[model samples]
Target: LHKEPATLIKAIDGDTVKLMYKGQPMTFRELLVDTPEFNEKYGPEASAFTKKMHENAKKIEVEFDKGQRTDKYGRGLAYIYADGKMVNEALVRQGLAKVAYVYKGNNTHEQLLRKAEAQAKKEKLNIWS
Candidate 1:
């Protein structure tokens, strides 16, 4: 998803982040990655971790789906790549996020994310615990 450059505005929560893209401010919800609400347990931890990832990465890129650039709520739906690493899978693999809103047709990094979740599940980390 490292196609274009975007400035990290803020990591609103674990699964969502605000970015300035092409002179416009947009908050892109990391696709297929679901984290906890800020009010929920372990939510702030996930958010802190995710926020650090973006702040420390230096270079951030976002990729939106062809026909699904933004969701019904108008939130941008896409994958976030920090440097050369994928933040979505990193969140899932690190036991901070769980794979969700998945399906058979809209599969890009499905297996990748599933495997990460599976590994985190086996370890019973974070939400899995």
Candidate 2:
């Protein structure tokens, strides 16, 4: 199920963000996409891109998988939608991240994300380069 609309308050990295949901502060990791470490190459770029994507978004939505709601670190695991597109998929399609941490029978966008990752690889885009 999806949570109520929230405001993206910060981009912790390419795949994690802080949001204000239901008047409470929440942090979530973008499901299915894994970007480089914050100190690794292209990491800052990915974070900047993610921040830019959320800058103009009026509202953000979080949709959780059927099985897991949070990661081992306690951050909510979800697909983040901003401005009309899925941020997780966008990062992969744009080559800022790779499709990773997929759990069988848990993800809703598995196939679609795999396809995008393949396309990004084939195109030799950003991270794939």
Candidate 3:
């Protein structure tokens, strides 16, 4: 899949972000990461971490799956890259999110994210703690 260049407009939550793509606004949910809800426990921390990451990013890129793209909610399912680093994997590595809602064929970074989550859990980091 081709990675589209985009501008990070806003961090909606721990696992969602708004971006300006092709002169249009789009909301993207991280493909394999699931963070706590804003009203739920540890949600604020996760959201804040995501916000900080995006805020400090110099460039952002969005990549969609080969065929399936948007979810039922109209949010684009994507692997987000912030300043060349995979933001989805970073969240799991940091224990800010868990590997969840992965589509077997659609997820390109499933194994990497799962491994990161396992390490975070074993180390009892952040949400895993």
Candidate 4:
């Protein structure tokens, strides 16, 4: 079952966000995407971009994908969709993040994400800057 879309309340950093879903605070990690560290050179921009995405966040479509749902840290890992689109692809398309598949065995979207990131970098988007 897919949870209905929700509005984003805040940007935790680059890869994580807080959303208001059905009156509850839902945390989502941008699937297959990771940005620069908070202290890194591009970190601030990444954060800003994520904030922007959250600002634009209205209703997000969510799905459960394979692999660890919540990391060891206990953050919910879900595939999010917004505006009739995948939130994961949104970040990559905007060049705010890079595809991150930490698990070695179950990588279904890795290559596609890699290609997208390469193109985003070639276009000199946020991270490439």
Best by TM-score: 3
lDDT of 3 by residue, 5-95 (tens): 9998888999999999888898999898899999987789889988988889998999887657889999888898888888889889989
**Steric collisions counted per model:** 0, 0, 0, 3
Deviating ranges (above 4 Å) for candidate 3? none
Q: After the best TM-score superposition of candidate 2, give how far the Cα of residue 67 lies from its true spot, in angstroms.
A: 1.3
Q: Candidate 1: which pairs clash? A: none
Task: TM-score for candidate 2, please give it.
Answer: 0.92
| TM-score against truth, every candidate | 0.91, 0.92, 0.94, 0.76
Better of 1 and 3 by lDDT: 3
Q: State which candidate has the highest lDDT.
A: 3
True-structure lDDT of candidate 1: 0.85
Per-residue alpha-carbon lDDT of model 1 for 1-129, expressed as tens digits?
337789998878899999999989988888888888888887898999899999998899987645467887778888888987889999999899889987444558889999999999899988888
lDDT of 4 by residue, 1-129 (tens): 355666777778877888776687868776678878889867787777767766775666565556666676666676666666666666776787878764753355667667878888889987776
Candidate 2 residue 24 C-alpha distance from true site, Å? 1.5
For candidate 2, what is the lDDT?
0.85
Per-residue lDDT over 40-119 for candidate 2, one digit per residue giving the tens place of the 0 to 100 score: 98899899888988887877887778888777887888888886688899999989999998887568898899999999
Report how far off residue 61 is in candidate 4 (Å).
Answer: 2.4
- Worst 10 contiguous positions by lDDT, candidate 3: 62-71
Candidate 1 at residue 128, lDDT?
A: 86
